[PDB]
């Protein structure tokens, strides 16, 4: 069994590199963030442009959705995070506290908290309703590349250029685990039992974090420079999805670690990929020489 992702739509509009693409939890929309200091909303099934959301002073590195698909959070080079209302396209709150570029962001499953990672080497926890910083973790000794809440929002996994992956207890802020090349990306598996981490040695690793053991190694793609998003594709077959510095989207069989598909269409590094929550749909976004988002669909 191999997927059969076919190109369906190209979403053009951004004037600079696209940095992140995310599908809304309700499966209706796609949000994109860009180096052009803009956020664009698009139809998840048709690629139809919906809205442009502006406010950030410098380029946006990440964007994330609240659980109810009504809010977005963005991480910008202006050292801030902005909570937006997706309906109005208006900035509700501006999260101030980080001393350098905010690189990554995420809401918790409840969507009452926001986790953020920055070049200031820290991980911050914010309250959505008040826009206040609740906890400032001295998480790492190099820029924080990724931050993610687990299934119940009880754990935060962070990664950094220091070469470490840290698992943190949300309410206490304590470090529960440090997993021992720069770590460019990290996230929990949908069940929260595993973590998928990318390193800048062209490698993806599936870890059982509590046991502190790497279970699977995924390679064949190019990744030595960029913090490329990787995903678990679960709607059909079980795949690992990731962009690559060779302008392809890579798809691996989760069990065999074999490459099953390489999606060709982008003219620059594929910085971000997202998997639709209910359909076999992949969104891919590329850098400066491309600036487009592509939507691909499959049987499995």
């Amino acid at each position: 069994v191999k997927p059969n992702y076919a190109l369906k739509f190209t979403l053009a509009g951004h004037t600079k590199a696209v940095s992140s693409v995310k599908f809304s939890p309700n499966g209706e929309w796609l949000a994109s963030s860009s180096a052009d200091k803009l956020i664009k909303i698009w139809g998840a099934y048709d690629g139809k442009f919906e809205k442009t959301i502006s406010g950030h002073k410098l380029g946006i590195s990440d964007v994330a959705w609240s659980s109810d698909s009504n809010l977005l959070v963005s991480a910008s080079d202006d050292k801030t995070l902005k909570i937006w209302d997706v309906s109005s396209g208006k900035c509700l709150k501006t999260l101030k506290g980080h001393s350098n570029y905010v690189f990554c962001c995420n809401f918790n499953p409840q969507s009452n908290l926001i986790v953020s990672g920055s070049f200031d080497e820290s991980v911050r926890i914010w309250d959505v309703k008040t826009g206040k910083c609740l906890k400032t973790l001295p998480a790492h000794s190099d820029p924080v590349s990724a931050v993610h809440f687990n299934r119940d929002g009880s754990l935060i996994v962070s990664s950094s250029y220091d070469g470490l992956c840290r698992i943190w207890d949300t309410a206490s802020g304590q470090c529960l685990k440090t997993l021992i090349p720069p770590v460019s990306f990290v996230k929990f598996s949908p069940n929260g039992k595993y973590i998928l981490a990318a390193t800048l040695d062209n490698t993806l690793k599936l870890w059982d974090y509590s046991k502190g053991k790497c279970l699977k190694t995924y390679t064949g793609h190019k990744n030595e420079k960029y913090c490329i998003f990787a995903n678990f594709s679960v709607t059909g077959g079980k795949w690992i999805v990731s962009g690559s510095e060779d302008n392809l989207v890579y798809i691996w069989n989760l069990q065999t670690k074999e490459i099953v598909q390489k999606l060709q269409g982008h003219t620059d590094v594929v910085i971000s990929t997202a998997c639709h929550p209910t359909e076999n749909i992949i969104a891919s976004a590329a850098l400066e020489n491309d600036k487009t988002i592509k939507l691909w669909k499959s049987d499995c």
């Binding site: 180096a35 410098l58 590195s61 690189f103 400066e288």
Partner: peptide
């Protein structure tokens, strides 16, 4: 934009 730039040799 930090993500689209990359970094350190």
């Amino acid at each position: 934009c930090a993500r689209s730039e990359g970094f350190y040799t």
